[PDB]
Amino acid sequence: SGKATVLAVGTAVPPKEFDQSTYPDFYFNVTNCNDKVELKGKFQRICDRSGIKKRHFYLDEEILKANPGMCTYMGASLDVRQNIAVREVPKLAKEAALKAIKEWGQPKSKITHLVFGTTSGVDMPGADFQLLKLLGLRPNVKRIMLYQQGCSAGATVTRVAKDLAENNPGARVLVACSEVTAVTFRAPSETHLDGLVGAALFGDGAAALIIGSNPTPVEKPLFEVHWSGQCVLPDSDGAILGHLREAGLVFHLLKDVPGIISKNIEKLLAEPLDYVKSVDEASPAYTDLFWVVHPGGPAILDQVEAKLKLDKDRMQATRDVLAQYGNMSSACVLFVLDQMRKRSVELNKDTTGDGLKWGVMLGFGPGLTVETLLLKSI
């Protein structure tokens, strides 16, 4: 009783779909890099093993032709990237939030808090303010705006909402994460091979939740958030860096991120599993939990699945999101939460979490930081 509960989830993506099989052709063409045949061949191999069937993007050929700075490797281009991101990030969030608010079924006036996460642009007032205005929420909604957060922020916003909901009687928290890759897109370069990873994986999308404690009989709970933690992994300094520059957002990958996560995942889970033992008086195996994992890339999923000896179906909701949308940074794990519920209905599962009682939500980001949440299904 009393635990922050997910009462709705909605998602949204830009309409234009980019097939992964032919994305190398598009990408090297629009960046005027067709003479880089060996690099294109490498990029094709990366895309072919990415686990991704398509991604959705706001950026298209027309916008890129109108803004040649964004088609360069490190040309000055932040102003145009910001123009795009500051406009489109709250608009995509609005679409997701309206879906979440419909599912919840209560009037918008009952929203008391708003937590907004993004890695795509910054502005003052922030995207939280813009979303408040776009939705016509009360002017005294309490906002928390989480900018430049990265891939762990879907878990972060859930952790933030948990304490808001639990400490404030009657509170109903609208959570939204929204990502548009206009700030990171750039030409491929032999001098930035780790850039090919992001170019193969990152896509656009937004997701929204309603979270509250003590659901009423007219609300419909989906997941309870029982425990939350955040930690920096050992021996991971500099594994992922992201710098916002005149050329936009640039990433650098300096360590084996899947290996570092896998090396530490059992230790990460000791604390939430001790919570479960306190409640249920026994220790589940890792494969006895459901899994809501940020699909950073296929190697993270494969290595965690192997390390924890998970049945192959446990990662399926995560892999389904990766396949249909790619890595949507902060929003991606919230799409997985939605897919977990959706497959529970279609596969006739006994609970919203793959028919299992307890589950783990994981987000990963620079630090290397891991966000862990213990979930209970409904």
Next chain:
Amino acid sequence: SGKATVLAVGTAVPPKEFDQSTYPDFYFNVTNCNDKVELKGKFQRICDRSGIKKRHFYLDEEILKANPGMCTYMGASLDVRQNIAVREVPKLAKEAALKAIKEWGQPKSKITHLVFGTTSGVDMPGADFQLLKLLGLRPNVKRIMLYQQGCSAGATVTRVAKDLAENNPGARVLVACSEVTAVTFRAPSETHLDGLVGAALFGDGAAALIIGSNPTPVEKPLFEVHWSGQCVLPDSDGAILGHLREAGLVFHLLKDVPGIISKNIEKLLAEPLDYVKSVDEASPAYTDLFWVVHPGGPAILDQVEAKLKLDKDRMQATRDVLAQYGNMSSACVLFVLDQMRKRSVELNKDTTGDGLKWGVMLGFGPGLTVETLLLKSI
């Protein structure tokens, strides 16, 4: 009681002091704008009525001469501004945090949460991570990184810490706000007269708090946080805009901020004063409260003081901070909190809030957004 309690405050500024009386000479010289004699006269008048005696800055003539882009009006300069701010913002916060931790008197290992606010630069991992590392905090400290927030964020971080402390038994929250004006400094221009306001007011500084519920016998409470709210004021759309561009952070002032605040301040305070009436069965006049106000500029303070009919001493702690440090954006209101406690010792007051029981903490930022907290003195 269990209310979130301020247990320590520490502050820090860059060492170099810039006398406000002679800042116009320095500013117009270093930007090579000495031929703009009428503009310099206007700036001198703004500085002379600013209520500021001095400000502290990390930026100095040597750094500006090394990086002449920052001495232009709108020349490309974000990369150097980011280099400075990403480095110096956590360093300044560390100094303030060490002072807060000393006053608190407990081991750093008892810090469970870290809330970091800034408007000065963005990076991944964030300034929160850098502070965690610089202080040698536990790797599983739960962090909230509030970037690009603006002048209301000192109140925002206190609001965030309140729910962390109250919802998590034993939680001890390190709050830090840190601002370095390297991101906003630029040449004066006859086409950007609102820029002269920021050039006259904004200074550098950092402040830190320890916040916890249920203080132990060896902790020493200073203030209790009893009520928190945030609201967008009516008819204020576009009053303050802040855009992060290839030229750094640019502000636009389009409406009368002091007038909008004073037009709405009584309405803002109705809910916290209703709380007071619920607890104390009494209705203090505004002048019966102590005041911890963001010193945005002298006009805000003068117009709020007149509207609420405050005795002139009520704004003194706020005006003392403005005089000695200028408007240090998110950190400034936390300096005022420290100054309120300092004057309570030196002026032999019966409580930490100017001898009064209940107090109002106010932050102001883009929206126009007002953060309001109700404090109880000790």
